[PDB]
C-alpha cells in the first residue's frame, strides 16, 4: 500500500496539477489571444481592401482628374445621483475565472489589480501556512482581457502569466499599461519587506514587461525582464514602487512609489502640525509619525517613478500639502485627467485622494472628504488628531463622475476594526448609496477598485481580501458592481 500511494498515485497527481493549474490555463489564455489577433487582422484586411474611390471619368474627349470595454473617458455616463436608502447595487462574483482559489493549506496575500484600454493586470502572492508568516510558494503576475460574458457582466480572462525564480524576494509591485504591453515594476529584496527592513535593503528594482496579446513562439516578446540601477533618487537614499497601478502619458510610465529619506535630511516646521483643535496632540508628532516608528532611520515620502520608453527611473516626490506618511498609492487616468489616491496609515484617517494638478512635481488637490474614513485601533476611524501609529488598510476610490465628483469603492464599515466590507458610492460630504459585500462579523483587509465602461455602462470591479469562515485565511474576491442610472 505504501508503495502504491508513493509510486502509482503520488507522481501522477503531481503531474496532473502541473498540467491543470499551469499548462492548460496557459494554452487556453493563448488560444484566446489568437482570437483577438485574428479579429484585428480581419478587420484591418477589410478596412484596407474595401477602401475605394470613384474612377476618373470622361466627357467625350476630356478626362476629369479629381483630388466592448474602455476606460472612463470624457463621456456623460449617468449614475444615480440622489441620497437613497433602497437597494440598487447588485454585486457579482467574477473571481471564478482567475487562479485565486487554491488548497486550504495556503493563503493569498498582496493582491494587485489594474486596468486600462480593455486590458488588465493582476497578481498575487501564494503562501504556505499563516498569511503573515508562511513561506512563499509562488508569485503569479500576469495580464489579460476584460471580456463581456453572455450575462452582460465583465469577466477577467488571463492570457499571459509570469513567475519569478524566487517568490520570497519580490515585493511591492505596481503596473502601467502602455502600447499593448503591461509594465510591472517590482522591488527586489533579500531582506524581506523593504518597509519593515529599510536599512538592509539593497535598493534595486526590476521591471517585467508583459505582452497583453502573446504569440505562441514569442520567446522574446511575451515576456522580458530588465534590471534597473539607473535610478535618479535626488535627495532620497532609496526608492521603491509602492501601489497597485499607475498611468501612462505618451511613452512615459508613472508608477506609485515611496522614497526613503534619512530623518536628518528631512525638514518639517512643527507650527504646521494641527494641534490647534486637539487638546492631547503634540506639535512634534507630525514628524515622528512620518516613519513607521519614532526612531526609524528613514521617513517614507510618497511620489511617482517616471520611466521613459524612448530608459531610466526618475523619482518624483509629492509636495507637502497635507503631508503624511508614505503608504501604498495609486494614480489612475479617469475622465480625461489623472487622479491620485494615497492610503493613510497614520493619524489622519480621512480618505485622502484628489485631482492631480501636476505630475512633476506631484501636486494633488486633496478632496475635503468627511464621510469616508479608514478603520483603525490609537488612530480610529474619523480621527484627525496627530498621534504616533502605523496601522491601517488600503481602500481606494475610483472617480466615476467628474462633474459632481462622485467616486466609488469598498470600505470597511467599522470604526475599531478592519471588518464588514461595503461597496459605496459617495460625495465628499455625503454617501449616496451602498451595498454590503460581506457580513458584519466577516473580516477584510485590502481593497482595490477599478472602473470601466462596458457597452457604455459603468462597472466597477472591486477586489476585496476577505477572510473565510472555514480556515480563516484571506482570498481576493472580485465583486463586479454595476452603477445604476436610476435610483431604484
Amino acid at each position, epitope marked *: 500500500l505504501a508503495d502504491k500511494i508513493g509510486t502509482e498515485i503520488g507522481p501522477k497527481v503531481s503531474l496532473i496539477d502541473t498540467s491543470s493549474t499551469i499548462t492548460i490555463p496557459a494554452n487556453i489564455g493563448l488560444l484566446g489571444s489568437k482570437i483577438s489577433q485574428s479579429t484585428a487582422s480581419i478587420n484591418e484586411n477589410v478596412n484596407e481592401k474595401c477602401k475605394f474611390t470613384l474612377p476618373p471619368l470622361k466627357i467625350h474627349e476630356c478626362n476629369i482628374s479629381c483630388p466592448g470595454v474602455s476606460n472612463l473617458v*470624457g*463621456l*456623460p*455616463n*449617468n*449614475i444615480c*445621483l*440622489q441620497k437613497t436608502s433602497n437597494q440598487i447595487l447588485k454585486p457579482k462574483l467574477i473571481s471564478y475565472t482567475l487562479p485565486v482559489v487554491g488548497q486550504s493549506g495556503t493563503c493569498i496575500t498582496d493582491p494587485l489589480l489594474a486596468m486600462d484600454e480593455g486590458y488588465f493586470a493582476y497578481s498575487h502572492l501564494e503562501r504556505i501556512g499563516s498569511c503573515s508568516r508562511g513561506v512563499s510558494k509562488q508569485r503569479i503576475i500576469g495580464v489579460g482581457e476584460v471580456l463581456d460574458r453572455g450575462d452582460e457582466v465583465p469577466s477577467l480572462f488571463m492570457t499571459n502569466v509570469w513567475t519569478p525564480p524566487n517568490p520570497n524576494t519580490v515585493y511591492h509591485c505596481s503596473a502601467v499599461y502602455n502600447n499593448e504591453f503591461y509594465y510591472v515594476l517590482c522591488a527586489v529584496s533579500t531582506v524581506g519587506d523593504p518597509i519593515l527592513n529599510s536599512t538592509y535593503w539593497s535598493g534595486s528594482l526590476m521591471m517585467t514587461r508583459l505582452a497583453v496579446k502573446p504569440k505562441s513562439n514569442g520567446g522574446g516578446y511575451n515576456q522580458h525582464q530588465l534590471a534597473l540601477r539607473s535610478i535618479e533618487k535626488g535627495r532620497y537614499d532609496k526608492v521603491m514602487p509602492y501601489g497597485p497601478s499607475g498611468i501612462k502619458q505618451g511613452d512615459t510610465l508613472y508608477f506609485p512609489a515611496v522614497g526613503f529619506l534619512v530623518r536628518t535630511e528631512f525638514k518639517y516646521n512643527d507650527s504646521n502640525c494641527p494641534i490647534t483643535k486637539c487638546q492631547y496632540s503634540k506639535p512634534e508628532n507630525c514628524r515622528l509619525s512620518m516613519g513607521i516608528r519614532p526612531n526609524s532611520h528613514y521617513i517614507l515620502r510618497s511620489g511617482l517613478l517616471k520611466y521613459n520608453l524612448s530608459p531610466k527611473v526618475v523619482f518624483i516626490e509629492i509636495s507637502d500639502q497635507r503631508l503624511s506618511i508614505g503608504s501604498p498609492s495609486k494614480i489612475y487616468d479617469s*475622465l*480625461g*485627467q*489623472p487622479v491620485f489616491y494615497q492610503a493613510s496609515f497614520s493619524w489622519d484617517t480621512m480618505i485622502k485622494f484628489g*485631482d*492631480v*494638478l*501636476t505630475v512633476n512635481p506631484l501636486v494633488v*488637490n486633496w478632496r475635503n472628504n468627511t464621510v469616508i474614513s479608514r478603520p483603525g485601533q490609537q488612530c480610529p476611524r474619523f480621527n484627525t488628531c496627530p498621534e504616533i501609529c502605523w496601522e491601517g488598510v488600503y481602500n481606494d476610490a475610483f472617480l466615476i463622475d*467628474r*462633474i*459632481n*465628483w462622485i467616486s466609488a469603492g469598498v470600505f470597511l464599515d467599522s470604526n475599531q476594526t478592519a471588518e464588514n466590507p461595503v461597496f459605496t458610492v459617495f460625495k465628499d460630504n455625503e454617501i449616496l448609496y451602498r451595498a454590503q459585500l460581506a457580513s458584519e462579523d466577516t473580516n477584510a483587509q485590502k481593497t482595490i477598485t477599478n472602473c470601466f465602461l462596458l*457597452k*457604455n*455602462k459603468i462597472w466597477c470591479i472591486s477586489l476585496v481580501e476577505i477572510y473565510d469562515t472555514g480556515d480563516n485565511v484571506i482570498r481576493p474576491k472580485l465583486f463586479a458592481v454595476k452603477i445604476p442610472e436610476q435610483c431604484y
Partner: antibody, heavy 99, light 97 residues
Framework: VKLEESGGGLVMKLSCVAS????????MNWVRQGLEWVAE??????????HYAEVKRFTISRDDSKSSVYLQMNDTGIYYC??????????WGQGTLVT | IVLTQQRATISCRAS??????????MNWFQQKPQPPKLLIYSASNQGSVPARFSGSGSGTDFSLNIHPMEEDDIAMYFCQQSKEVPYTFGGGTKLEI
C-alpha cells in the same frame, strides 16, 4: 475653479486665465451671450484640434504653460471662458464685454 | 441640430435626436441677470444644484422640472445639445413667479 476673462472693450484679442485646476487636461471653449457657442480648442492628446461656429474670421489658440486660452477675432456681446468637462460646459467665468 | 424652447416646467424640442452611447446629450442651465450655471447635464442628472431641480427626456423631447419654484429661482433657462460640434443652444426662456 476660476476662469478670468480679459481683453474686452470697444473696437479683438480676448484671453482667459485658468486657476484651481489643471488647464492642460481640459477642452477650452468660448461662448457669447441667448447663448451661442463660438470656438473650441483641444489639448495635445487631440493634436490641438479646433472647431468654429459657422465665425469660422476667428482663431482659437492656447498656451498650457501659462494656463490660458486666447481668442483672436478678426459680434457684440459678452464673451465667456468655459471648461468643458466630459463634454459638459460645467464651468463659466464672469465674462468680458466686446463692443 | 436646432433646439426650440408650486411646480413649473420648461420644455425643449430638438430637430434631431441627441441620443448616442446610451446617453441623451441634453444639458440645462440657469442664468440669473450672472454667467450660466449648470443645473442638469445629459437627461436627468444633477450638476454640482438643489433637489428642486430635476428633468427627463429621450430622443428629441426633453424637459426641465422645477419644484417648488422659489423667489430665488427666477432666471433664464437654456437647453444645450452636446452630442455634436458645433454645439447648440435653444433660444432660452424666462421663468418667473
Amino acid at each position: 475653479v476660476k476662469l478670468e476673462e480679459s481683453g474686452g472693450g470697444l473696437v479683438m484679442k480676448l484671453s482667459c486665465v485658468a486657476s484651481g485646476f489643471s488647464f492642460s487636461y481640459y477642452w477650452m471653449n468660448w461662448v457669447r451671450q441667448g447663448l451661442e457657442w463660438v470656438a473650441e480648442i483641444r489639448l495635445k492628446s487631440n493634436n490641438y484640434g479646433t472647431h468654429y461656429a459657422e465665425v469660422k474670421r476667428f482663431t482659437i489658440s492656447r498656451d498650457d504653460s501659462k494656463s490660458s486660452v486666447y481668442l483672436q477675432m478678426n459680434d457684440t456681446g459678452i464673451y465667456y471662458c468655459t471648461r468643458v468637462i466630459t463634454t459638459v460646459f460645467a464651468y463659466w467665468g464672469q465674462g468680458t464685454l466686446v463692443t | 441640430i436646432v433646439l426650440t424652447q408650486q411646480r413649473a416646467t420648461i420644455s425643449c424640442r430638438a430637430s434631431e435626436s441627441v441620443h448616442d452611447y446610451g446617453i441623451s446629450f441634453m444639458n440645462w442651465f440657469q442664468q440669473k441677470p450672472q454667467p450660466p450655471k449648470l443645473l442638469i447635464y445629459s437627461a436627468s442628472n444633477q450638476g454640482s444644484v438643489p433637489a428642486r431641480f430635476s428633468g427627463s427626456g429621450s430622443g428629441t423631447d426633453f424637459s426641465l422640472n422645477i419644484h417648488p419654484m422659489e423667489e430665488d429661482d427666477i432666471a433664464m433657462y437654456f437647453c444645450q445639445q452636446s452630442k455634436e460640434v458645433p454645439y447648440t443652444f435653444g433660444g432660452g426662456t424666462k421663468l418667473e413667479i
